[PDB]
Structures are given as C-alpha cells and as structure tokens.
Design a protein around this ligand. Sequence first.
Ligand code: 306
Length: 272
Amino acid sequence: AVPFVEDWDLVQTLGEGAYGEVQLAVNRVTEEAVAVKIVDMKNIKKEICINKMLNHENVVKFYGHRREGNIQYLFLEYCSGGELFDRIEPDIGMPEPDAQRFFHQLMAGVVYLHGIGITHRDIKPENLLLDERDNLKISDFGLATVFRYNNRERLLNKMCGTLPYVAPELLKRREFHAEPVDVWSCGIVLTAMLAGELPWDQPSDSCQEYSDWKEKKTYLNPWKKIDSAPLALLHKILVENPSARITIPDIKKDRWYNKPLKKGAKRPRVTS
Ligand SMILES: O=c1[nH]c2ccc(-c3cn[nH]c3)cc2cc1-c1cc2cc(CN3CCCCC3)ccc2[nH]1
C-alpha cells in the first residue's frame, strides 16, 4: 500500500553526544518530520522499554525502533523549537510569563511520568524540547527508571543526573525517594529560566553558593534577579530535606504558579 512511504531521508544533525547523534528525518512521500536517535551499539534496551509506555503531550513521543545489525535507530518526535536551553539568555533568563508557561508544562509532563511510576532523573534545559507552538516536551529517557511497580515504591540508590541539577540527598544519602529528586531538578530549571544562571556547581555544603542559599542570602546574584512570588516558590522547592520539600500537587497550589501572567498566542486581531 503506497510505495516508498517507508523511506526516510536524514536531512540534518539536530545534536550529538556521548552515545549517538540525533538527526532530522523527513519522509520521502509525506514529508513528515521525525527525529532519529542513532546509537552505535558497539541502557538502550531499557530506554526503548520506557519510551514505549509513554504517551503525553508534554513528553517526546516514541514511534518505534529499528535494530538492523548493531546501529540502533530510535524514531522519536521532532520538536522544531529545539532545546529550552537555547531559550535561556545567559545571566538574564527569559520573560517571567514564558517561564511560568514552560514550568506549567514541565509540571504536567512530570506529573504524568510520576503517575505511571517513571522518574526521568536528568531533567535540565538540554532535555526539554519545544515544538512549533513552543509546547515543552520532556526527552531523553536514557537515565530514566521505574520507581513504582504494582503500586509499590522502590527507593533509588544509583547516582544519576547532572550535578548542578541533582538534589542534595543524592549526594549525601544511600537511598532516596525518586519524586523529590525530579522536583528539585525542576526547581533548578525554573531558576535558570528566571535568572539565566545556575545557582551552584552542586548542592553540597562545601559549595559556597549553596551554603548562602541555605542561609537565606537572596540578595546575592542568582536570587536577587528573581521576583518575590516565584522566589517564594523556589524557597519551597529547593529545600534540602526531601521529606519537607514541596510536592507537585502543592506546587500546583502555589501563589506564583497560579498567578495570571501570560496571554494567549495572539491568534486573532483586526480592529474596526
Ligand atoms: O526534535 C528533536 N527531537 C529529539 C527527540 C529525542 C532526543 C533524544 C536525545 N537522547 N535521547 C533522545 C533529541 C531530540 C532533539 C531534537 C531537536 C534538537 C534541535 C536543535 C535545533 C537547533 N538547530 C539544529 C540544526 C542545526 C542548527 C541548530 C532545532 C530543532 C531541534 N530539535
């Protein structure tokens, strides 16, 4: 049925890394675009497994995979907007309304993942992609894992993530709950979106920037650029004790989270 519809052309490189490269693939017939993650197999098995059980508007869709010898081909959703990382201006951030909208969407995606027992473990601007309408989608489940199965939660112990975004308990406790960790990384992402900089190299007492935060020195560079409303949310998210840290349902009740700020997407306009 309909010849050539199976053929995809690798038009360009969307990004590379330490395992594979991601390229934009365009269908020969329909011209539909998708992102193909090429992993030179010479982790990936679990990534595919996790991706197959993902279906949400704020999570990069997985279409399928092609073994073909050793080179593994993962067909994923193409997000023309690129990485949220590139939408963050160094030392500045982005307009608060935009950050709020992206944060809302990030929360939606994380609620979904946690809802099906999956923790991402490496949430950062480089892994949050944007589609044509700037809708945020969580990507790269290479470090993800199931933390809840048969309604039984499994505590984590593996060191995973990226230091500036990792929660403090991952560095000082043998075991820890999965959810507060993703929540913390989302808080670091929010900070980056509102200030254009990361607060610390890592959440450890030996890190001066981290000690200052614990001491409420918000008059210092990072926090001084953030308005009081979102800063109060950050004070609830970036809490060292994961058991006292705000949970997502409570984040959804936060004053800034619910503050009207962002208008629609300027759809219509014809005065007179
Ligand atoms: O759409 C994407 N889907 C996707 C799905 C899964 C993973 C993924 C990574 N590991 N596991 C899964 C990674 C990606 C990355 C994507 C992407 C990057 C990018 C960069 C630019 C900037 N330009 C790129 C072209 C050169 C000029 C700059 C424009 C659009 C754009 N879209």
